[model samples]
Target chain A: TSELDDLALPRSIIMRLVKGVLPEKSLVQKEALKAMINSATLFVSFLTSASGEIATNNNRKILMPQDVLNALDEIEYPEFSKTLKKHLEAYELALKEK
Target chain B: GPLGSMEKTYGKTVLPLSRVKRIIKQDEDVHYCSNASALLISVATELFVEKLATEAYQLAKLQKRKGIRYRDVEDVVRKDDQFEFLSDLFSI
Candidate 1:
C-alpha cells in the first residue's frame, strides 16, 4: 500500500463532479476544492479500512459488496448503505441484462 | 416503485468506478476488489460528495455569496455533528 498522501482523487474530475451537484454559475474557492478532495480521500480510506477488516474476518481475500455494506454500518453511515444497496441491486440487474 | 424512481434519477453515478477502485486498493489490506464492490464505493462516494457540496452551498447562500469558500466548508464541518469526524482535518 502506498502512503495515504499519495492516494488522492483527481482534482479536475472532482471539481467536475462538485459542479454537477451544485447550482449553475456557482463558484468554488481553491481551498474549498482542497477540502473536498481531502474529505473524499479520507472517506475512502475509512470505508476501505472497515470493509477490509470485514473481509479479513470472513477469511475472504477479495472484498465483497456485502463487506462494503456492512462496513458502512460499522462507520455509522448506515444511511448510505440503504441507498447504496438499492443502487447495487439495480447495478447487478443491469449487468445481468447486458 | 421507489426502486424504479431511483433508477430513473440515479441510474448512473457521477464518479468513475476505476478511480474509486484505485483508491480502495491504496489500502494495503485490500488486495482484490470485486467489480460490484467498486461500483458501490463509487456510488457511495458520489453521495458523500453531494452531501458536502449541498451543505456548503447552503452556508455560502446564507452569506449572500454565489460561490462556496474554504471557510464555508469549514463552518459546515464545524457546526454539523455528523461531520465531527472531519473537524480535525479542518481545525483552526
Candidate 2:
C-alpha cells in the first residue's frame, strides 16, 4: 500500500520531507511512514488541547502562537519557551508585513 | 493478586490506592475525590508512559540501532512538543 493511503497530509510533501532527512537509496516502509504521520497527528492534537485552554481563559477567538507559549508555560515547560519565543517573534513579524 | 491491596502478577506492581487519593487531592485542591477520578488519572498516566516508550523506540530505530539511548529519547521529546511539559526531566 502507498504511504498516503491513510494520512491527511499529502504524499508528495511528506515524501520530499522524508527524502530531505533520510540518506540516498534508502527506503521507508509504508507502516513507518504512517507511524510518523501518526506521531504528528498526536502532537498536533496535544498542542490544540493545551493551547485551547489558554485561549479560552484569555477570551481569545484566535489560536495564535501566543496561546501556544502561554500553554507551554502553564504546563511548566520553561525549556521550550526560549525556542518558542523566537518562533513567535518571527510569526508576529511576518503577520505585520501582510 | 488480591483485591483492596497493592499486589500484582509477575513483573508488574499494582498502583497504591493511597497515592491515587493523594494525587487527586493535590491536583484538584479538594478534600476528597471519587475513586473513579483517581483511577482515571492513574490509567492515563500509564498510557502516557506507554506513548513515551513507543516514541523512544521509534527514535532509536531511526538511527538503524536497536538500542534506545538517552539521546534517542531526547530526540523524540524534541520532535513531540506535547512532551514539552516534561522537558526538564530530559537531559540535554
Candidate 3:
C-alpha cells in the first residue's frame, strides 16, 4: 500500500517503533524512524534516492545500518523483512528531505 | 469515611491514553554561577539524566514484552549511551 503504517496488517511498523525505543535521544528516534520508513516510501521519492544515503554503499547495492539490526534483534519476531523494508523507506525519505 | 478505604469514602475511574503525544517547547535564560558550583551542578544534572535514561531503557524493555510503545521516550531521557561511546572513541 502507499501509506504503509497499518500495525494490524501483517506489516512492520512495530520494528521501527521498537528502534525508536533505543536508549537514544530525540534525534536518534527521529532518524531511526526515518530509516525505517525509508525502506517503504518508494513512491514518496525514490527517483532521486540512492542506496548509499539510505544505508551503506556496497559493491552490489547497500546494507541496512547496524542500529536497524539491533532493533530487529530485540523485536523477538520470527522475521523482519517488513521492518527492513520500512527502514529503507525511512532512510530514503530522510535523504530526500536532506 | 474521609479517612477510610474506597468502599467507605472514595471511587476510582479510568481515562483513555493520550490520543497523541505532547510536545513542550521552552527557552530559559542561563544564570551564571561559580566554577565549582557549575561542576557540582553539571555532575548532578548528568547523574539525574543518566538515571532517567537507565530507567527508561529498563522500562521500555519490559513494555516491549507486552507490545507497548513509549509516548515520549526522550522527555524522560537526558542522553544516549551512544554519545558516551563517542567520548570513549577518542579517549587516551
Per-model root-mean-square deviation over C-alphas: 4.0, 19.5, 21.5
Superposition TM-score, candidate 2 onto the true structure = 0.44
**lDDT (10s digit) by residue, model 1, range B1-92:** 66555335343566767767777877888878888888777777777877898899999999898998998889989898767778778874
Residue lDDT tens for model 3, A1-98:
32334311112442334334444442224433332332222211111122122232333222223323333333222143353444445545655676
Q: Where in model 3 is the C-alpha error above 4 Å?
A: A1-28, A31-98, B1-32, B65-92
Relative to the unseen true structure, what is the C-alpha lDDT of residue A56 in candidate 2, on a scale of 0 to 100? 62
Candidate 1 clash figure, as a count: 0
- For all predictions in the order shown, the interface RMSD in Å is 2.0, 16.0, 21.6
Selected candidate, larger TM-score, 1 vs 2: 1
Give all candidates' CA lDDT scores: 0.81, 0.46, 0.28
B24-52, model 2: which lDDT tens digit per residue? Answer: 33322132333333333333333344455
DockQ of 1: 0.58
Poorest 10 consecutive residues by lDDT, candidate 2 chain A: A1-10
Q: Please state the CAPRI-style docking class of candidate 3.
A: incorrect
- Tens digit of per-residue lDDT, candidate 2, span A26-80: 4555644444444333333344455556656767644445665665556554445
Chain A TM-score for predicted structure 2: 0.64
User: What TM-score against the true chain A does chain A of each candidate get?
Assistant: 0.80, 0.64, 0.24
For all candidates, state DockQ relative to the true structure.
Answer: 0.58, 0.02, 0.03
> Which parts of model 2 have CA positions greater than 4 angstroms off?
A1-7, A18-26, A74-80, B1-92
